[PDB]
Design a protein around this ligand. Sequence first.
Ligand SMILES: Nc1ncnc2c1ncn2[C@@H]1O[C@H](COP(=O)(O)OP(=O)(O)OP(=O)(O)O)[C@@H](O)[C@H]1O
Ligand SMILES: Nc1ncnc2c1ncn2[C@@H]1O[C@H](COP(=O)(O)OP(=O)(O)OP(=O)(O)O)[C@@H](O)[C@H]1O
Ligand SMILES: Cc1cn([C@H]2C[C@H](O)[C@@H](COP(=O)(O)OP(=O)(O)OP(=O)(O)O)O2)c(=O)[nH]c1=O
Ligand SMILES: Cc1cn([C@H]2C[C@H](O)[C@@H](COP(=O)(O)OP(=O)(O)OP(=O)(O)O)O2)c(=O)[nH]c1=O
Ligand SMILES: Nc1nc2c(ncn2[C@@H]2O[C@H](COP(=O)(O)OP(=O)(O)O)[C@@H](O)[C@H]2O)c(=O)[nH]1
Ligand SMILES: Nc1nc2c(ncn2[C@@H]2O[C@H](COP(=O)(O)OP(=O)(O)O)[C@@H](O)[C@H]2O)c(=O)[nH]1
Ligand SMILES: [Mg+2]
Ligand SMILES: [Mg+2]
Lengths: 683, 683, 14, 14
Amino acid sequence: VPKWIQLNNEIMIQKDGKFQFDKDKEAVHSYFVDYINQNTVFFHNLKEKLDYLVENQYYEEEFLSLYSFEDIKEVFKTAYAKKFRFPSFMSAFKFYNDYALKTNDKKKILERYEDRISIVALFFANGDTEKAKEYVNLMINQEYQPSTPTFLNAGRKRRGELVSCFLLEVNDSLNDISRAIDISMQLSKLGGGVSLNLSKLRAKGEAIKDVENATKGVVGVMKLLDNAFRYADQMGQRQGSGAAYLNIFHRDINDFLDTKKISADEDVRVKTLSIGVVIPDKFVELAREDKAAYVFYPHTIYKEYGQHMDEMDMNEMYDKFVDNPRVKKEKINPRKLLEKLAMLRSESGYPYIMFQDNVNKVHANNHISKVKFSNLCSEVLQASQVSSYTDYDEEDEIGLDISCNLGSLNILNVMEHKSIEKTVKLATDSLTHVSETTDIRNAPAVRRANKAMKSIGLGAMNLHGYLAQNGIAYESPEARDFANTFFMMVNFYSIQRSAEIAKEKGETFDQYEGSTYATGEYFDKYVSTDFSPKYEKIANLFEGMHIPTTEDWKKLKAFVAEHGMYHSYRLCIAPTGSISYVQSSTASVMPIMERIEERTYGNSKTYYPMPGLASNNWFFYKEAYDMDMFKVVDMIATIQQHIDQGISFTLFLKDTMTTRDLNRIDLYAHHRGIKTIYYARTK
Amino acid sequence: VPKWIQLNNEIMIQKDGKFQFDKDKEAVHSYFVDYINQNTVFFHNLKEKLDYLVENQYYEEEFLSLYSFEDIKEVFKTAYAKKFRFPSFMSAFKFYNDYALKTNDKKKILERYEDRISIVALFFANGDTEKAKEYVNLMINQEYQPSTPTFLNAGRKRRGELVSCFLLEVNDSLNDISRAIDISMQLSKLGGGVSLNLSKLRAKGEAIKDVENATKGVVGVMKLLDNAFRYADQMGQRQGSGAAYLNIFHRDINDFLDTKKISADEDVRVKTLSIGVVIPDKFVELAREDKAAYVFYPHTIYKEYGQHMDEMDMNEMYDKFVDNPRVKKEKINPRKLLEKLAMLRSESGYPYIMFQDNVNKVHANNHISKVKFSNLCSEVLQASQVSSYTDYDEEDEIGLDISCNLGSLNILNVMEHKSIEKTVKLATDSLTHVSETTDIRNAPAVRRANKAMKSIGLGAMNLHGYLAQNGIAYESPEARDFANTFFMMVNFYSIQRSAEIAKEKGETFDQYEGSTYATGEYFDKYVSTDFSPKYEKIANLFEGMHIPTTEDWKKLKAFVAEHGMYHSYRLCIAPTGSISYVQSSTASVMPIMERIEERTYGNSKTYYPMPGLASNNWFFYKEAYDMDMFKVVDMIATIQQHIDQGISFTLFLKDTMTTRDLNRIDLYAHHRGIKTIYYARTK
Amino acid sequence: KATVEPLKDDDFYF
Amino acid sequence: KATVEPLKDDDFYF
Ligand SMILES: Nc1ncnc2c1ncn2[C@@H]1O[C@H](COP(=O)(O)OP(=O)(O)OP(=O)(O)O)[C@@H](O)[C@H]1O
Ligand SMILES: Nc1ncnc2c1ncn2[C@@H]1O[C@H](COP(=O)(O)OP(=O)(O)OP(=O)(O)O)[C@@H](O)[C@H]1O
Ligand SMILES: Cc1cn([C@H]2C[C@H](O)[C@@H](COP(=O)(O)OP(=O)(O)OP(=O)(O)O)O2)c(=O)[nH]c1=O
Ligand SMILES: Cc1cn([C@H]2C[C@H](O)[C@@H](COP(=O)(O)OP(=O)(O)OP(=O)(O)O)O2)c(=O)[nH]c1=O
Ligand SMILES: Nc1nc2c(ncn2[C@@H]2O[C@H](COP(=O)(O)OP(=O)(O)O)[C@@H](O)[C@H]2O)c(=O)[nH]1
Ligand SMILES: Nc1nc2c(ncn2[C@@H]2O[C@H](COP(=O)(O)OP(=O)(O)O)[C@@H](O)[C@H]2O)c(=O)[nH]1
Ligand SMILES: [Mg+2]
Ligand SMILES: [Mg+2]
């Protein structure tokens, strides 16, 4: 066993009844003085390194050609001047195993952390040396972290796409279904997770040109998509991951759910395609009143009204659907469907739950379209217009397929540096650059939506780490007050940066004029309610930083009205799975699953303590499963009130609790304004 | 139990030690006295019937509008003047259960046999009343039978395409694979059987964008195609049928074959995807000499030579591939592979066998392309060019995808009427009309090849029936002499009609000038070898009909040289599954499987004796399984020497014979010039 | 397989 | 499954 592995395992060997956390630090030293420094490839100077990486097809020469070599040297020197040290063995291990650039045979390390950060910063700046240095200081301080696609692939010749998630709308036609399969394979080839809205597809037993009981429903398309994602599996490196979203009022909703039952037959079971359920407020109202509900056949509704079932408001059209004899429907028990959802989530963590009305009551771009589904991580909530893919030799009507670039603020590092504004603006600029340089030649709706919406996702990580390292319980009202203030600041500065970009470029996102940003409605709660901390401890935490007041929000509203906004969507809190290790941060705004996690790599086992875990903050690092899910819902709703898109909200459940407890948590989340629920992980 | 069913089951009841065959005739009467006439919709006049069928979206207005009502009435009167009577119960049952037009509620019969024949004739003639009457006389004499798609759908508004055999070339790209899946779905939606060539696809463990061991091989594409064919199943009417063809020198050939093993796992086996193997002469030579063969990785060959492995002659390329270090390959035992093919055919009848050099040594259009694969029934053998389907908003390079037009001569009815020439020419005209009226807007290469090649397939059936009713054993040399003469006349008149159509329209098929028809090579064996019958009995059978001599063939060769040929391909012998029942004929040129076949419809049993079966010809109606497969191969080769495309050749094996016997039959078929082997049906 | 417990109403109100 | 015999060199000639 390696020396650093032994040093890392020495953490759990208690000395005087206490964990040896400091041993972890020793491990990193070993991991660098025995493996990383020996396996790294050193050159005489930076010029030889850059030339070797350029000619050997490791780096794209275009982004490096925008800078003179003196500027690149200055950027690299700025990166290395911080003398960044990984505080834990797992941070360095995760970076150098998942994100550091290696040779073709993967026998040596070509990129250090500073080298990777410098390359990403140079790609972000697009020829601006000072902006490149700003990005270097932002990332080496670990205030901001580009998503895994962006961080891993920026400036690389053999790179994939920098966009993490893609959302596709599938129209009710064989041509559209085949095009959706093709686009899903193309985007999984690019490495991104693909989510498809199957609510427009007509249910099983519908008519295909006057011959009835002919359609296979959404389950056949689900099987096709599952096979497509199995085939396109990132060249066999990462398993192809897809998501299917269906409205709960679709007739196939049961069969949909039956795809995830552990007793499902092979002709129905789907195993590589995640499932999500979109629940309007009408379904929750029907379940609450115990009135038997009706699931609908989408094609009959489309024939009668000319619009898809998910294209209009069910809260106002459900009674018309039920009373219309030309609309076909089936009777269901909404409470039984809710119990089935809870049972399925207990068994397998599926489906994702999207509370459609919670998303669309604060959605700023309802004029473009209502949010009808979410992404594979159930945090992207954007307007999408379905595409009309016609026959060959016929022009296709290209709609809008959602796609946003992810980037997470490290809350602990951002607040320690007292740089919410600067970090938010620089992250917004980097995400705008990632969107601008993204061009997908096989997904037309994705390309058009990227060009028009200009949507970005600016997330946050290390919420629980910051709270525990500052002596604040994650479930405490003080933690929710901190989240309220911090994310109001993040939203304020993201809106300010979006408006500044719109002013400097003279262009807003498409159809901005009909948005609530243009009408000033979006700023209502910000121009009447003060989001400054209500607790003295939180206010002290925010000292040295100008917390925006109602007057600052009014000025920002006037600025947006004058100049507009460049981005339709700005903030989305992704799970941030593996890149949180490199940043020494807790995953997303979720509470920690465990204080020390035991992970098996190769034939060895390693223990990763939570960042900053110690004796004095052991009980502040409360495990998520031991927490009250209602208070976690309260925290997520408090954050969500300042996030325009959704938050990947994973439920952490105990084995003792029943499906009724899961249903109660889901209904409280819906009551509190939670937009989406990601996973039901049971301990 | 209905009266006609009792009268049909009375056949097996033996009187005086003989089957009551004549009772079947009585059954037909009952089937018309009790059921057909009662449930047949009658109108006061044909005008009312046509108006009701057109208005209720049963027929098409366009083809009926080309004639005055007097001409349509005259065509119907010509059809009804024959007073055609079905000789067996199963003929009428199959027609009125599969082909007769029924109401939307499927309880009444709108079309009789004469009505359907008149409608198909009017569709064929395209406005010529005399031509329509000629077609009506052709089909009511049952000399020619349009295929199930043409016969069932001609003149019907609610219909699929008139072509059901489609051959697709799949290029080695994700765009091309997705387009192939889409086109397969669209053509299965039209009701057609789709065959895909997978030899150009790179094998498992090949490189995608210079990353190693990334390709899933052809088995993943087969899984995708199998899911696509399961999804597209004629609006839930018939099981989606597809075929995949792989060259035996393709690296995946074993895994390909492993998709049909019973022991194969769920992620390996494809259930609704037929498989065929293309066997070049090089593989047979390697197996014969017991030299170990090599299966090559197609992408390495493409990178080294710039052409696909299946696009070059393996006979001259195999040594260069083996000696090339940059071409990747694995060692295999060709005899072990042949034994595996025989074992798989014994287990399930798969794969289809295509002898590439047997097809291409007589292929007239090798300049366009060599025949690389066959159809789902393994009888369509045509030149195909792969298409380069690029990314979106980029122009595709449309190639040639095979789609030939099926139609079968009834050898018994044709020869008893002494009308080989007239029937062949009228069938060629009808096939040309159906090919010209076919327009598929979702298969670009299929449409382009239909417009350019103008390929049709004119088949034959009732060969064994005709031989048995004339006191000729199917395995006798007299039967082969008759087949030689009859199919040489069929080829002569098909070529004459093609040249006449080319002269009339002033156009030939695309790239005809490079064909062996233009150079006169095709007629070589016809201008030197006399194909007149060598037996007096066969000559007396051909009495009253002019048998083309060598001088007639020289005149036809000169005529083709002067005027060209309209069809790239003219003759292909399809299995003729259900139309053989309606025509009271034995299926294809195959020998009969059973003298009397027992079938179960609903909860009732039915008995179909072979047409013309009696005590006198009971011995001549020898069952296929009891026959020597070498003599069946000899007869099929005798026919194949006059057929430009292939013949659906099913092997009929006993359970006693081993895989060595199957391999011997396959090798004798290869030796005798058999182009394709369809199925290995074990009794 | 978590214990299936029916929704008892008043679980929709908070 | 069906009985399996190996292919002899004489089965390749007719
Ligand atoms: N935790 C760590 N994170 C990142 N790099 C590290 C870490 N530990 C060691 N290294 C790398 O290995 C080298 C070993 O040097 P070490 O940290 O032991 O101190 P040093 O030789 O006194 O110099 P310096 O600390 O100034 O780099 C470091 O210079 C650095 O490049
Ligand atoms: N074997 C058969 N094949 C086809 N149709 C038949 C057959 N037997 C009876 N029919 C149908 O039933 C009708 C009655 O025929 P039947 O044998 O009673 O005498 P017919 O002289 O042919 O009668 P009709 O006055 O109807 O011409 C036929 O006209 C025909 O429509
Ligand atoms: C994308 C993808 C392709 N393939 C197969 C199918 C294709 O025939 C082959 C790659 O075809 P292409 O998609 O054309 O590969 P490429 O153009 O990206 O790179 P290159 O042309 O240099 O190979 O690999 C997979 O098996 N899995 C996959 O996920
Ligand atoms: C062709 C086909 C369609 N379908 C379903 C899936 C599609 O969402 C739906 C629409 O198919 P379409 O492609 O729209 O079929 P169509 O346009 O010919 O019929 P219509 O005019 O009624 O739209 O039919 C199947 O389930 N199986 C099939 O084989
Ligand atoms: N020398 C060297 N520097 C590197 C390499 N990779 C990254 N760097 C960094 O890039 C910057 C360039 O410095 P360098 O050219 O080596 O300075 P010089 O030695 O005075 O020429 C330094 O701050 C290094 O930390 C490498 O392979 N070799
Ligand atoms: N009357 C009638 N004739 C039909 C029908 N279907 C096909 N036919 C045929 O179409 C032809 C039309 O002739 P018809 O209108 O009956 O003129 P008629 O013989 O003087 O009474 C006839 O020869 C019929 O055999 C039908 O439903 N009604
Ligand atoms: Mg449609
Ligand atoms: Mg390619």
